[PDB]
């Protein structure tokens, strides 16, 4: 059905949308942004330690 309609199911881009001075559900949204940044820095720290070397061997 998705290929015949050619339409894709929408993903949640709410984490990009979040804004300051908002309600309790959006307080959950900004803390979600903090956990995503700590994970993103951890994921970037592994790539830096590996170096290109890992892109070289593949």
């Amino acid at each position: 059905a998705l290929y015949t309609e050619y339409l894709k199911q929408r993903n949640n881009k709410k984490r990009r949308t979040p804004d300051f001075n908002d309600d309790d559900d959006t307080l959950f949204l900004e803390e979600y942004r903090r956990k995503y940044p700590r994970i993103d820095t951890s994921r970037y720290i592994p790539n830096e330690s590996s170096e290109v070397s890992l892109l070289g061997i593949v």
């Binding site: 199911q9 949640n12 790539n47």
Partner: protein
């Protein structure tokens, strides 16, 4: 009874942008293959 895949520097996208493109490319290809 090792393979290495270098994850992209911009690795949110694995939940949003990468996962939608995998199930788009699965859906469109097989339908085009049924058309084939």
């Amino acid at each position: 009874e090792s393979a290495q895949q270098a994850s992209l520097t911009e690795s949110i996208p694995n939940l949003l942008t990468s996962l939608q493109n995998e199930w788009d490319a699965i859906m469109l290809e097989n339908f085009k293959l049924r058309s084939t």
